[PDB]
């Protein structure tokens, strides 16, 4: 992926609290995480893709190669096994932990970067625009 490269600012969020609740996130974290308006910085160097998230809540970073499972510590401190692939221009990220999973799709749509986060029956949509 590389039409994803850039700096992106959160401009809208739907159902994020519900998503965090479903994932198992404690209330105090949800309160701070849900108010935050992160920047996401995507860069690519050969086959390594780097996704940074920066906010008043927490900074995080993952670097990965498509199709290679890796250990991820999430912003809420879950230790998950993550696999990210590129599927019709959509970055498909699955996190697996304790026999559970969540799926995070990052897609380009017009000039927006759209993030869809799915946990059980909950779907949260987060839209970012170029900073
Ligand atoms: O606040 C964050 C990180 S910021 C973020 N922004 C998005 O648009 C999407 C996601 C993610 F990881 F849930 F997909 N996190 N935590 C994500 C994992 C669970 C608790 C909240």
Curated annotation (Swiss-Prot):
Intervals of motif Nuclear localization signal: 21-31
UniProt keywords, alphabetically: Acetylation, Cytoplasm, Lipid-binding, Nucleus, Phosphoprotein, Transport
Record keyword Kinase present: no
Effect on the protein of changing residue 22 to D: In a breast cancer sample; somatic mutation
Gene3D superfamilies given in the database record: 2.40.128.20
Protein residues bound to a fatty acid: 126-128
A GO term for molecular function: fatty acid binding
Record-listed Phosphotyrosine modification sites: 19
Cellular component GO terms held in the UniProt record: cytoplasm; cytosol; extracellular exosome; lipid droplet; nucleus
First-listed, main subcellular location of the protein, grouped into a coarse class: cytoplasm
A Pfam family: Lipocalin
Subcellular location: Cytoplasm; Nucleus
Modification Phosphoserine, positions: 12
Subunit (UniProt): Monomer. Homodimer. Interacts with PPARG.
PANTHER family for this protein: FATTY ACID BINDING PROTEIN
Entry domain remark: Forms a beta-barrel structure that accommodates hydrophobic ligands in its interior.
Function: Lipid transport protein in adipocytes. Binds both long chain fatty acids and retinoic acid. Delivers long-chain fatty acids and retinoic acid to their cognate receptors in the nucleus.
Family: Belongs to the calycin superfamily. Fatty-acid binding protein (FABP) family.
Protein name: Fatty acid-binding protein, adipocyte
